[PDB]
Amino acid sequence: QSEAEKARKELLELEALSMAVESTGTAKAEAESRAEAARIEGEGSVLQAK
């Protein structure tokens, strides 16, 4: 069981890296989509105001 835990430590490190990658990817994708939509809406608002 000690040897199994020795391997499980590295396995958990890899799992943590994968989880961080997935979470940051999802968050950045949603944030960038919303930001692009807001920028387009703002430019349209400027033109409509003119």
Binding site: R39, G42, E43, S45, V46, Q48, A49, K50
Partner: protein, 49 residues
């Protein structure tokens, strides 16, 4: 972007308000002249009577 749009619309509204208010001021001055003319004429006729 909101600041840009606000500046554009503010300048347009200010131009319109300035024109409207100057026209209203001219009309009010004319109305005041007419009112004072009528008042002084009626005062003159009643004083003479």
């Amino acid at each position: 972007l909101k600041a840009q749009a606000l500046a554009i619309e503010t300048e347009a509204e200010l131009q319109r308000v300035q024109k409207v208010r100057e026209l209203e001021l001219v009309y009010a001055r004319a109305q005041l002249e007419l009112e004072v003319s009528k008042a002084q004429q009626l005062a003159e006729v009643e004083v003479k009577k």
